[PDB]
Every structure is written in structure tokens, then in C-alpha cells.
Design a protein around this motif. Structure first.
Motif, PDB file in Angstrom:
ATOM      1  N   UNK A   1       0.823  -1.199   0.000  1.00 57.90           N
ATOM      2  CA  UNK A   1       0.000   0.000   0.000  1.00 57.90           C
ATOM      3  C   UNK A   1       0.858   1.250   0.000  1.00 57.90           C
ATOM      4  N   UNK A   2       2.122   1.116  -0.413  1.00 58.02           N
ATOM      5  CA  UNK A   2       3.012   2.271  -0.481  1.00 58.02           C
ATOM      6  C   UNK A   2       2.613   3.241  -1.586  1.00 58.02           C
ATOM      7  N   UNK A   3       1.897   2.762  -2.604  1.00 61.48           N
ATOM      8  CA  UNK A   3       1.207   3.654  -3.528  1.00 61.48           C
ATOM      9  C   UNK A   3       0.155   4.481  -2.802  1.00 61.48           C
ATOM     10  N   UNK A   4      -0.545   3.868  -1.847  1.00 59.07           N
ATOM     11  CA  UNK A   4      -1.661   4.515  -1.172  1.00 59.07           C
ATOM     12  C   UNK A   4      -1.219   5.339   0.027  1.00 59.07           C
ATOM     13  N   UNK A   5      -0.203   4.891   0.753  1.00 58.05           N
ATOM     14  CA  UNK A   5       0.286   5.641   1.897  1.00 58.05           C
ATOM     15  C   UNK A   5       1.133   6.833   1.488  1.00 58.05           C
ATOM     16  N   UNK A   6       1.470   6.953   0.206  1.00 57.29           N
ATOM     17  CA  UNK A   6       2.197   8.112  -0.279  1.00 57.29           C
ATOM     18  C   UNK A   6       1.309   9.342  -0.329  1.00 57.29           C
ATOM     19  N   UNK A   7      -0.002   9.152  -0.411  1.00 52.15           N
ATOM     20  CA  UNK A   7      -0.963  10.242  -0.272  1.00 52.15           C
ATOM     21  C   UNK A   7      -1.318  10.485   1.193  1.00 52.15           C
TER      22      UNK A   7
ATOM     23  N   UNK B   1       0.400  12.045   9.710  1.00 54.11           N
ATOM     24  CA  UNK B   1      -0.389  10.825   9.709  1.00 54.11           C
ATOM     25  C   UNK B   1       0.464   9.583   9.884  1.00 54.11           C
ATOM     26  N   UNK B   2       1.618   9.503   9.224  1.00 53.72           N
ATOM     27  CA  UNK B   2       2.433   8.300   9.334  1.00 53.72           C
ATOM     28  C   UNK B   2       3.211   8.221  10.645  1.00 53.72           C
ATOM     29  N   UNK B   3       2.954   9.125  11.588  1.00 58.27           N
ATOM     30  CA  UNK B   3       3.309   8.891  12.977  1.00 58.27           C
ATOM     31  C   UNK B   3       2.128   8.318  13.742  1.00 58.27           C
ATOM     32  N   UNK B   4       0.913   8.744  13.390  1.00 59.14           N
ATOM     33  CA  UNK B   4      -0.300   8.093  13.874  1.00 59.14           C
ATOM     34  C   UNK B   4      -0.484   6.726  13.226  1.00 59.14           C
TER      35      UNK B   4
ATOM     36  N   UNK C   1       1.998   4.798  12.037  1.00 56.71           N
ATOM     37  CA  UNK C   1       3.021   3.918  12.586  1.00 56.71           C
ATOM     38  C   UNK C   1       2.708   3.516  14.011  1.00 56.71           C
ATOM     39  N   UNK C   2       1.855   4.265  14.697  1.00 57.70           N
ATOM     40  CA  UNK C   2       1.538   3.975  16.085  1.00 57.70           C
ATOM     41  C   UNK C   2       0.360   3.019  16.233  1.00 57.70           C
ATOM     42  N   UNK C   3      -0.468   2.864  15.204  1.00 54.22           N
ATOM     43  CA  UNK C   3      -1.579   1.928  15.269  1.00 54.22           C
ATOM     44  C   UNK C   3      -1.224   0.531  14.782  1.00 54.22           C
ATOM     45  N   UNK C   4      -0.175   0.388  13.970  1.00 55.35           N
ATOM     46  CA  UNK C   4       0.317  -0.948  13.648  1.00 55.35           C
ATOM     47  C   UNK C   4       1.043  -1.570  14.834  1.00 55.35           C
TER      48      UNK C   4
ATOM     49  N   UNK D   1       7.260  -1.668   7.926  1.00 54.50           N
ATOM     50  CA  UNK D   1       8.407  -1.317   7.095  1.00 54.50           C
ATOM     51  C   UNK D   1       8.033  -0.332   5.996  1.00 54.50           C
ATOM     52  N   UNK D   2       6.834  -0.463   5.423  1.00 59.89           N
ATOM     53  CA  UNK D   2       6.369   0.479   4.408  1.00 59.89           C
ATOM     54  C   UNK D   2       6.155   1.876   4.971  1.00 59.89           C
ATOM     55  N   UNK D   3       5.738   1.975   6.229  1.00 54.55           N
ATOM     56  CA  UNK D   3       5.518   3.277   6.847  1.00 54.55           C
ATOM     57  C   UNK D   3       6.840   3.897   7.281  1.00 54.55           C
ATOM     58  N   UNK D   4       7.753   3.088   7.837  1.00 53.70           N
ATOM     59  CA  UNK D   4       9.091   3.569   8.177  1.00 53.70           C
ATOM     60  C   UNK D   4       9.891   3.969   6.944  1.00 53.70           C
TER      61      UNK D   4
END
Ligand SMILES: [Mg+2]
Ligand SMILES: [Mg+2]
Ligand SMILES: [Mg+2]
Ligand SMILES: [Mg+2]
Ligand SMILES: [Mg+2]
Ligand SMILES: [Mg+2]
Ligand SMILES: [Mg+2]
Ligand SMILES: [Mg+2]
Ligand SMILES: [Mg+2]
Ligand SMILES: [Mg+2]
Ligand SMILES: [Mg+2]
Ligand SMILES: [Mg+2]
Ligand SMILES: [Mg+2]
Ligand SMILES: [Mg+2]
Ligand SMILES: [Mg+2]
Ligand SMILES: [Mg+2]
Ligand SMILES: [Mg+2]
Ligand SMILES: [Mg+2]
Ligand SMILES: [Mg+2]
Ligand SMILES: [Mg+2]
Ligand SMILES: [Mg+2]
Ligand SMILES: [Mg+2]
Ligand SMILES: [Mg+2]
Ligand SMILES: [Mg+2]
Ligand SMILES: [Mg+2]
Ligand SMILES: [Mg+2]
Ligand SMILES: [Mg+2]
Ligand SMILES: [Mg+2]
Ligand SMILES: [Mg+2]
Ligand SMILES: [Mg+2]
Ligand SMILES: [Mg+2]
Ligand SMILES: [Mg+2]
Ligand SMILES: [Mg+2]
Ligand SMILES: [Mg+2]
Ligand SMILES: [Mg+2]
Ligand SMILES: [Mg+2]
Ligand SMILES: [Mg+2]
Ligand SMILES: [Mg+2]
Ligand SMILES: [Mg+2]
Ligand SMILES: [Mg+2]
Ligand SMILES: [Mg+2]
Ligand SMILES: [Mg+2]
Ligand SMILES: [Mg+2]
Ligand SMILES: [Mg+2]
Ligand SMILES: [Mg+2]
Ligand SMILES: [Mg+2]
Ligand SMILES: [Mg+2]
Ligand SMILES: [Mg+2]
Ligand SMILES: [Mg+2]
Ligand SMILES: [Mg+2]
Ligand SMILES: [Mg+2]
Ligand SMILES: [Mg+2]
Ligand SMILES: [Mg+2]
Ligand SMILES: [Mg+2]
Ligand SMILES: [Mg+2]
Ligand SMILES: [Mg+2]
Ligand SMILES: [Mg+2]
Ligand SMILES: [Mg+2]
Ligand SMILES: [Mg+2]
Ligand SMILES: [Mg+2]
Ligand SMILES: [Mg+2]
Ligand SMILES: [Mg+2]
Ligand SMILES: [Mg+2]
Ligand SMILES: [Mg+2]
Ligand SMILES: [Mg+2]
Ligand SMILES: [Mg+2]
Lengths: 77, 46, 94, 62, 103
Positions: free
Chosen positions: D1-7, D12-15, D17-20, D50-53
Motif C-alpha cells: 500500500x506504499x502507492x496509497x500511503x504516499x498520499x 499521519x504516518x506517525x499516527x 506507525x503507532x496503530x500498527x 516497514x512500508x511506513x518507516x
RNA sequence: GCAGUCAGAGGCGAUGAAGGACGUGCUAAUCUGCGAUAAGCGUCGGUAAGGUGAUAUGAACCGUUAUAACCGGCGAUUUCCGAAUGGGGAAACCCAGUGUGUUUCGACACACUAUCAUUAACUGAAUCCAUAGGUUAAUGAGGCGAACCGGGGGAACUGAAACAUCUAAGUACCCCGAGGAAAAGAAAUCAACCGAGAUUCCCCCAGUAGCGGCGAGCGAACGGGGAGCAGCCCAGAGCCUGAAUCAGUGUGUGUGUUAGUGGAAGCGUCUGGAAAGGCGCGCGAUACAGGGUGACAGCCCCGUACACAAAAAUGCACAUGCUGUGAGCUCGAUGAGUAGGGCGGGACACGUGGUAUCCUGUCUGAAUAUGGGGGGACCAUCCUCCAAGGCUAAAUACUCCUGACUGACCGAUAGUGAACCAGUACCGUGAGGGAAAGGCGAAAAGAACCCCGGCGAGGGGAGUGAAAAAGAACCUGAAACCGUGU
RNA sequence: CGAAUGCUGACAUAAGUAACGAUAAAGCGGGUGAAAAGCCCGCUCGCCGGAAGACCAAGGGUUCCUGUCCAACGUUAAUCGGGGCAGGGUGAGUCGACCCCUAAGGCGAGGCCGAAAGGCGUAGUCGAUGGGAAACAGGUUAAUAUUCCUGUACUUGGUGUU
RNA sequence: UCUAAGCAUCAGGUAACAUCAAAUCGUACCCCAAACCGACACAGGUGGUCAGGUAGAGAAUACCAAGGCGCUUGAGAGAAC
């Protein structure tokens, strides 16, 4: 080490040939002394560990000419 | 009867260990020999 | 305050055993399986958040791995760390 | 989902990364007891950390 | 890259079961297909307490080489071979006999 | 495994190496991979119906017309130890300081701090100016690795039928420094009255001339044939002013490299467990290199000759913008504690001899173009050359590593020590030493079920298989050795 | 290849012989079990008792405790075991280490010295086998306890007050 | 315990009270021994600590306590040596 500081002389190795031509290994050491040189431009003394052949070079060239060679060599005095 | 091997871990390590085999020119060539041979355990050191 | 990402790595599993069961019904002690570089101030700070229950004191110990044999071949299990977390009074845990 | 998490954003990717990692903690305790008969779920969350990091370092000066 | 695939109908070229048409069931990474019905062997299956098998002498399918079959051509009724050409900018397969596309 | 041929590459490291320790799975161990994003993350390409590394099944899942998996380019992440570099240390551990941001005040996270070298600024003793020194900065080094290369040191056994000169031998070994090669290199060189024109390397000259307790041994040059070819700068002033050459950065443009793509043509019968074999009748070949397939396949499969391919990074080449370096003419300069010498040794094939020449530990010491070196003691004449300052490609040397191909090389007591989880098990305080161990079958179809036995070991049936004296203590199954029967 | 007190593997012989490791010593009843001189329980007998008891350091490294197993290992049998396999078990402000300080000795910025490698050594920095704060009694597990629990204490630091 | 540079109306000192903190590592088991050093379940070697009774000068010696053991081939016979 036993290194002359102007010329760069150094201990070299050879033989002690006897009357029956037995060869044992010896060394040839250089005639090193230490000596203060009055440098007139800087107005101080400089001690150098120099051979007697090297004290004769400073007699010919001059102490200001000699010390310039040792700076460009990268050697400290 | 007392035999020649009387163990002591501190004297095991000071005399033959890795930091002893690095503090001299000749001890580092002992490690370079044992790496080219392929020793799994390279020193005395646990 | 220890970061919330470090508190989510300190706890690994609960330890199941007869001795671990006995201290839960006598001494109000849960016996956990923690990380090896965890510390007593983090074992206290991750039970008090992720389990929402107050802690009195933490008793840790490191357990050493066993040497086994896979037929003819020798191998060893890894060392791990084991905590005795003492809960407070009236404190029950899911 | 790195195509999708790029938007998404660094906020957000601290929130995200905290819910995974909350999700990873509840999978590891559930697989400690005999209560996780879906052990393909440990690997999915660890691969998605790993995708979020990765997207956090692409944003932070890369 | 491959010629024989998952649900092709093949025809066996060598062995105790030379000549029998049949659908392939899977292909393994060792260069071996297991074709449905063909290479049937008998294994003295050992019962176990768990897992719920009664255990007996089961007859089941054994793996045959991919080289030992060939894609049966339905129109000609023979064993024929497989070529690789490109149609529509896509890779396809066709028969070496009569040059007609596998579809 | 071993020996080669052809072609790459000739290094890796403070942007943290070589070598490790510890972790890392749906995982108990070991192997490979990876590093707290931990058998992997992103991206760009290749390719795809099958996948989730090995022993090694299982479980839980992902994927099928395109972000399943795999292959390659460039990225991301990369714990601890190790030059290990913040201090220390019994390698994988122990203890911080400073600065910056948060803090539910209990405390967390990130960055920096070795040494040396050179350079720069601020400062700064005896002591006035100074100077040694002091403090921050920037830039560089350090460690490891196969042989080859250059230099600093340098044996003895042995041979001489003993042994001391001599030999072995400037070999073995230790140390310092490089590089993809190094080193050497443009005549103060030979020749012989004719001439050649730097260095390196191969063949001759030649076991020759010589050296030598004239013993054992050591051993050239002159000249000839080849490989390869290349010549320039500074001890410096005017005139010309960016024209000759070299590197660096860039860019276009070839050619490789790092994934890939298509690739011909065969059937009937016989024996057989099984056909590729035998026997018939056919077809392909710019492809009958090779390998696999249940026995021996040009035509079943993988390939092979041939024909195409790159988003991206990169090697050797061309061309083009580029900083610095300067061509050409013109007059002028021409490497002094140096050449030679005495003494002590070393080098020359040449052991001090009648010994020329070279290097120098020691003591001395010129002439300078009208001058100086060499021409094998030495002198006159004649010839040739210009030392005491540098630079330089090719031909030559080598293989830890990479790829392709070969062998009147080996086939498990051989070939590596190691075909197998081997520099392992094991032995030693340590340096260090160092094994044994390959083959079921075509495919596990690896022996359900009944029986004796201790819910044993082991065996007898049954069944699988062409074969079960192929039953995992497994192809063949020799000898010594030990038994039962006549 | 027949020989080299040849090299490696296999296998004989002596020979079913010597031996079975302190002359502290055993007897019986019951249980378990396929099987009991050796294991478990019981009663008797004998041996140690400044040790052959109990507690540690060094060294070892799971031998600890429980369930199961008897191929090999155990100089015999083995139902037993320090053997095989699986699970469990080591809880500290006060004990020890670390940490603070130093001894002998080690290394050592510069320094001085040496063909190279290197040698010694100043400032400093390590190095215990020595100096430096503080916890006791009772209870509890199959297996840890001055650590767990009950009772009763003490010690040194940061913070905030007055 | 004493001051010097410094700091002076701040620090800091020290008496009471309140408060928070005391991390990390080791801790099982043997340890005159079948677990360490001796190729062995080997009569050998191996530092410290605790020290009951009766007799006795005694940590000798004899017999015992607490506590621990009968030493991992047994059964017969009753020759030489
Ligand atoms: Mg000699
Ligand atoms: Mg406590
Ligand atoms: Mg602890
Ligand atoms: Mg798999
Ligand atoms: Mg250090
Ligand atoms: Mg450090
Ligand atoms: Mg320190
Ligand atoms: Mg000699
Ligand atoms: Mg001799
Ligand atoms: Mg001789
Ligand atoms: Mg050169
Ligand atoms: Mg001439
Ligand atoms: Mg293809
Ligand atoms: Mg083809
Ligand atoms: Mg076939
Ligand atoms: Mg056959
Ligand atoms: Mg000159
Ligand atoms: Mg001379
Ligand atoms: Mg002369
Ligand atoms: Mg001379
Ligand atoms: Mg001279
Ligand atoms: Mg001359
Ligand atoms: Mg002459
Ligand atoms: Mg000259
Ligand atoms: Mg020149
Ligand atoms: Mg071999
Ligand atoms: Mg053989
Ligand atoms: Mg061998
Ligand atoms: Mg050992
Ligand atoms: Mg059986
Ligand atoms: Mg065979
Ligand atoms: Mg056989
Ligand atoms: Mg035989
Ligand atoms: Mg023979
Ligand atoms: Mg003979
Ligand atoms: Mg023989
Ligand atoms: Mg016998
Ligand atoms: Mg007998
Ligand atoms: Mg006899
Ligand atoms: Mg007898
Ligand atoms: Mg006897
Ligand atoms: Mg006896
Ligand atoms: Mg006995
Ligand atoms: Mg009895
Ligand atoms: Mg007995
Ligand atoms: Mg009893
Ligand atoms: Mg006594
Ligand atoms: Mg064990
Ligand atoms: Mg036990
Ligand atoms: Mg047991
Ligand atoms: Mg038995
Ligand atoms: Mg036995
Ligand atoms: Mg046991
Ligand atoms: Mg203490
Ligand atoms: Mg020193
Ligand atoms: Mg120094
Ligand atoms: Mg000191
Ligand atoms: Mg100290
Ligand atoms: Mg001490
Ligand atoms: Mg102490
Ligand atoms: Mg105990
Ligand atoms: Mg204890
Ligand atoms: Mg005892
Ligand atoms: Mg015994
Ligand atoms: Mg003993
Ligand atoms: Mg008698």
C-alpha cells in the motif's frame, strides 16, 4: 637514530675481513655530534645532530641556506 | 597428584586472549594466520 | 517519560507455569516474558499503560538457554528475561 | 500500500506507525496463548511497519 | 517460458501408462507434473491417532516428468508440440502442427 | 578436485573494512539470507501461473493478465565487537561529558567529543620585542588482503668426498613502501679510424673469453637476429598572447558490461518393468556443442547455430564547451663539498691481482667549453661523449577474485586436508596439529493388516516393486576370518 | 608386490583365560515390574562423625527438580541413574560484582633513544589478593531465598520547603 | 578540618519536614568431589568457614549425637601357593 640531520647519513653495513679472509658482519657509523648554530636572522641558537661532513657543509653554504632545506624536507629542528 | 593444568579464567584471558593478541605486532600476525586458515574460534576468549 | 514506541516492545508474552499460577492467586503477581534489554522502569511503565493496572514493584531475572541435540548435532537455545510484576490491591487483569 | 500511503503526511504516518504497533502487540499476546489460529497476521503487520518507516525517511530529506 | 500448464490435457509418451489422455492437476518445481488419474500407485498409509485418517492401502497419483507428456491436440487427436509467437503484443502459444493458436 | 587457454577485474576501509558476536520465521536446532524496516522495504525495468530459502512434512495464507514469486539497475534500513576513534577493558562489555529539542519532574530522544600531520585564526612563559607553548577550526592519514614489484637487514644445513678462503646465496626469513604493474629510461653509452644511437624483454653469441684453496665451482661482454618504439622539461629574460600536449569537469555520440527474446525437424512394429535400442519407412540442419528423460534420442524436454533487446547505472573509446598549464621565434645560462684522491669495506662474471669502472663509513678536494668524463694498470696522439636536476607509454612480471571453454589429468586409501554442516569433531596452556565419513529405487510406490515378543529389540507372513539375499545396518558384494550339512 | 620392525582398514591368536578398582558388611518381609542380591517402603545389622556432616570460593556449566524410556553409556542385571527425551526452576537499595580508591606490576600524549620493527619513560591511565554506605527474625516451593511473604528496621542520594 | 582565587545580598552551607530514587549483572546444582585438575563413575591432587556428648592435656585416640554412608558383579567351596 644515528642520522645526520643535514646530509642524511646513516649507519651502513659491511664486513670485517681478517688476514685469513674470514667475513663477519659489522656496521659503519656516521661521525655524529650535536652542536648549537648561531642563526643571525632569527637571533637565536639551533641545536642540530650533524656529522662532521655536515658541519663542513654549513661552512660552505650558510646556516640560513641549510635550514631552508630542512623545512622543505619536512624535518623539524 | 598435582598436574600441569590449573585453570584460572582471568589468567586464561590476560595471557592468550583477543586484547592480548592485539597489543603487539607479532600477536596480530597470529590472528592473521588463523583467519587465512579459517578457524571458527579465533581466540581463547569466550 | 519513555516514548510510546518503546513501551510497545518491552512485553513479549505471559509466562505459563505452576509457579507462575501460584503467585497470581497468592501474592498478586503476574509473571511475564519480557525483552532482554528491558529495564525495571520500563517493565513497570508498560504494565501500567498497556494493561491499565497499577504496579507495586518489579523483580527480574534472566533465564539461560539449554544445550540440546538435533540427533548428532549440538545446538543451543537463546537466553531470555523474566519479570515478576507485583500488582496492587483490588487490581485484576484481563 | 506504499502507492496509497504516499498520499499521506508525516503527521499521519506517525499516527499510522503507532496503530500498527498497537496491533502488533495484541497479535503477539494472542499468539502467546493458543488464541491465534491465524498466524499469517503476524507477518502482515511486521511487513507494513516497514512500508511506513520507509515513507518517513523518503519524506524526511531524501 | 513453460509449455504444459495447470489444466492442460496431455498424452503420455513413455512408461507404463503411455497413450492415456488426461487433465494435468499441478506442476512441481522439479520439472514434474502430476496428471489426474494416470500414474496411480498404492501406498500403505499408516494410521495416526490425531488428524482423523482411518489408514489403509490408498491408491493415489505419482509425479511424471514434463518431458514424458505433450499437449494433446483436440482437433487432430494426436500428440503435438508447442511454439511461442506474439499476438496483440502479448505472448501466446500455438501448435507446431497446423500453426493454430492454443486458446 | 587438478593443470591450463582466452577475456575481464586488479583492490577494500572513518559514508566504519576484513573477520566476527548476538539477534532475525507460523519455528526447537543447525545451515544460507538479512539487521530492531531483521529469509526482508521502496522504485525502475525483466518476466510470469505459479508461489511462501535448506534439512523438512505440516499449519496459516498470497497470486492467475498484473505492485503473487523470481531475475537485474539505482535507492532505503543496516544492532554490538573489530583500525574502533568520548574514557576504560578480561573483543562482542563497563562509565560518561557537552549541546540541542520534548517532558504527566520519574526522566527520555538526537547530535558531537581519539590521535597524528599540514594549514588558519584567536590567544601566549621565563624576558622588553619575541619565541617555545596553549586553544578552536578545516583537510588528510591510520586497518586488512593472493602473488608480482622496489628498497632497509640477512642465515645455516649442504658441496668441496675432512675444512677455515669459496660454495649454498644476496637464496630462506624479518621489516618499510607502493602500483595495476613496478622498476629502468633518452648517453659525461659503446664502437674502433668504419660506424651505431634511451630503457625493458625473447633467441643467438656460449659453457666461449675469463674468474677460481686456478680446487669444488662461478661465468660475461662485443656483435647479430626479433618484440616494442617516443621523446621532452627546469636551473630565465624580451617578443609573441590562450595557437602544441596533458588531466579534470560536462555534454552529445559509439562500443561493451549489469536482467533478457524467438530458435528447426518422427512415427509404426519387436524385445522388455520401462525404448532413446533392434527392424522398417520419413524429415531438419548456417543448429549431429552439450545435458536430461524408467536401457543407447539431430527430430520428447533444456538448449545449440543464428537473429533481436535496456528505464537505469557504468568501463574503454571519439567529438564538443570548459578552469589551470602554456606553443613558436629571440638572445643567454649550462646542476661544488661535486668530479678526482688517501683509508676501511661492498658491487662489477672479475676472490686485490699487473685491475680499469661503479657506490660510500671516514679524512680531504678541482677545472668549469681555452674546460671536463670514458675508451680495462699507465702515458702521448686520435676518436666519442657533456656527470654532479627532473619527467616518460608499449613490449616484461603476477592471480585472492570473475566468466566461458579444453585435457592420451584424478575417480573416493585417488584428486584439495576436506565430493559428506572440514580447518569441523578431536588433541595442546599456547603457537600449532588435524581426521574418518560418497552410491536404496525409475519413482518412496519407505512395508496398511495379522503373528511371537516386555504396548520391546529382532523375526515370520502379507502387500509394494523388474528385482526385497534392492528393507533404510540398503548397487556389486572378493579375501582373511567363523559356522551348519554330506 | 610377499617381505622395506613398510602405510590404512578389516579380522584372528592367546581365551571365554586374567580381571570386574580399597577386606566399612549384610539379612529378611512387603511393593513395583516381562524379569528384583542391587530400585521404593518397613524392620534389623554394620561404617564415618575435626568427617565419609554442613556452608563457600576457584573451576565446571544445567549435572538441579519432576514425568517418561532402557538401544548405547554404567566393568554384572537393571524397573534405577550425574544416561536418552520433554517440561519446569535462579525474584535483592542492604549479599556479590559493577562503581570509588590505590599496591606490585602493565600501558603510556608529548619526550629521549634505536638500521626498520622497536626500547625505556614524564604527565596521566589501568590494575586486588587490600581500604570505602546500609537487614534481621520467623514462614513458605517438587526445585530459589538475608532476594518471595509476615513482623520490625536501617542507609545514601536528588527535589521542594521553612 | 582550614582557607585562596572567585561569588557577595544570588548562591552555597546545615537543622527539621515533605518527597522521589537506588539502575545493570550474578544468584539453580556440585564444590576433599562420580560434576574441578588427573584419557576412566580413577584407593591421587585441591583455598576459606562452622566445631555437640562421655572419657582425655588435646582439633590425638576410642565409642557415639545431629547428619551422612555400606564404596555398581554376585553365589559356593574351605587344595597347593
Ligand atoms: Mg660467511
Ligand atoms: Mg522487593
Ligand atoms: Mg537480579
Ligand atoms: Mg517453501
Ligand atoms: Mg580504545
Ligand atoms: Mg568508544
Ligand atoms: Mg574506564
Ligand atoms: Mg659454512
Ligand atoms: Mg659445517
Ligand atoms: Mg663437505
Ligand atoms: Mg614509472
Ligand atoms: Mg661515430
Ligand atoms: Mg527463450
Ligand atoms: Mg528449439
Ligand atoms: Mg522423454
Ligand atoms: Mg537398466
Ligand atoms: Mg646543485
Ligand atoms: Mg669518489
Ligand atoms: Mg683509483
Ligand atoms: Mg676504497
Ligand atoms: Mg669524495
Ligand atoms: Mg668518473
Ligand atoms: Mg687502451
Ligand atoms: Mg653536469
Ligand atoms: Mg637527464
Ligand atoms: Mg580423500
Ligand atoms: Mg568403492
Ligand atoms: Mg585425507
Ligand atoms: Mg579445547
Ligand atoms: Mg518391528
Ligand atoms: Mg543401479
Ligand atoms: Mg548389498
Ligand atoms: Mg569371505
Ligand atoms: Mg599385499
Ligand atoms: Mg621379493
Ligand atoms: Mg607387510
Ligand atoms: Mg578366543
Ligand atoms: Mg566365568
Ligand atoms: Mg591359560
Ligand atoms: Mg586359572
Ligand atoms: Mg579370577
Ligand atoms: Mg574385589
Ligand atoms: Mg566395586
Ligand atoms: Mg528384598
Ligand atoms: Mg548389593
Ligand atoms: Mg532400606
Ligand atoms: Mg579423630
Ligand atoms: Mg544433559
Ligand atoms: Mg536428579
Ligand atoms: Mg528424569
Ligand atoms: Mg533387557
Ligand atoms: Mg549393561
Ligand atoms: Mg538425568
Ligand atoms: Mg554491599
Ligand atoms: Mg611503557
Ligand atoms: Mg609517542
Ligand atoms: Mg602508573
Ligand atoms: Mg582506577
Ligand atoms: Mg577484592
Ligand atoms: Mg571489598
Ligand atoms: Mg538448595
Ligand atoms: Mg545455593
Ligand atoms: Mg564432602
Ligand atoms: Mg565405583
Ligand atoms: Mg577419587
Ligand atoms: Mg584360606
Amino acid at each position: 637514530s644515528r642520522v645526520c640531520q643535514v646530509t642524511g647519513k646513516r649507519p651502513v653495513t659491511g664486513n670485517n675481513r681478517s688476514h685469513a679472509l674470514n667475513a663477519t658482519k659489522r656496521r659503519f657509523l656516521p661521525n655524529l655530534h650535536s652542536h648549537r648554530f648561531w642563526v643571525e636572522s632569527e637571533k637565536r641558537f639551533v641545536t642540530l645532530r650533524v656529522s662532521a661532513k655536515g658541519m663542513r657543509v654549513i661552512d660552505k653554504k650558510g646556516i640560513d641556506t641549510v635550514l631552508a632545506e630542512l623545512r622543505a624536507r619536512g624535518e623539524k629542528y | 597428584m598435582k598436574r600441569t593444568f590449573q585453570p584460572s579464567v582471568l589468567k586464561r584471558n590476560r595471557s592468550h586472549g583477543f586484547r592480548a593478541r592485539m597489543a603487539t605486532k607479532n600477536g596480530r600476525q597470529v590472528l592473521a594466520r588463523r583467519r587465512a586458515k579459517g578457524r571458527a574460534r579465533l581466540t581463547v576468549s569466550k | 517519560m519513555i516514548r510510546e514506541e518503546r513501551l510497545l516492545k518491552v512485553l513479549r508474552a505471559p509466562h505459563v507455569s505452576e509457579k507462575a499460577s501460584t503467585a497470581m492467586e497468592k501474592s498478586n503477581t503476574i509473571v511475564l516474558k519480557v525483552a532482554k534489554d528491558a529495564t525495571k522502569a520500563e517493565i513497570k511503565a508498560a504494565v501500567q499503560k498497556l494493561f491499565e493496572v497499577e504496579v507495586e514493584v518489579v523483580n527480574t531475572l534472566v533465564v539461560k538457554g539449554k544445550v540440546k541435540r538435533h540427533g548428532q548435532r549440538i545446538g543451543r537455545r537463546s537466553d531470555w528475561k523474566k519479570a515478576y510484576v507485583t500488582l496492587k490491591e483490588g487490581q485484576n487483569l484481563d | 500500500k506504499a502507492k496509497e500511503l504516499r498520499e499521506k503526511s508525516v503527521e499521519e504516518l506517525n499516527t499510522e506507525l503507532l496503530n500498527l504497533l498497537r496491533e502488533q502487540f495484541n497479535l503477539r499476546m494472542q499468539a502467546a496463548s493458543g488464541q491465534l489460529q491465524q498466524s499469517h497476521l503476524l507477518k502482515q503487520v511486521r511487513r507494513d511497519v516497514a512500508r511506513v518507516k520507509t515513507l518517513l525517511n523518503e519524506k524526511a530529506g531524501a | 517460458a513453460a509449455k504444459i500448464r495447470r489444466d492442460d490435457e496431455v498424452i503420455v509418451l513413455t512408461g507404463k501408462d503411455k497413450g492415456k489422455r488426461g487433465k494435468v492437476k499441478n506442476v512441481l518445481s522439479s520439472g514434474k507434473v502430476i496428471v489426474e488419474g494416470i500414474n496411480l500407485v498404492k501406498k500403505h498409509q499408516k494410521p495416526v491417532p490425531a488428524l482423523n485418517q482411518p489408514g489403509g492401502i490408498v491408491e493415489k497419483e505419482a509425479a511424471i516428468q514434463v518431458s514424458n507428456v505433450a499437449i494433446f491436440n483436440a482437433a487432430t487427436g494426436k500428440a503435438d508440440r508447442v511454439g511461442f509467437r506474439f499476438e496483440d503484443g502479448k505472448k501466446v502459444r500455438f501448435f507446431k502442427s497446423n500453426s493454430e493458436t492454443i486458446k
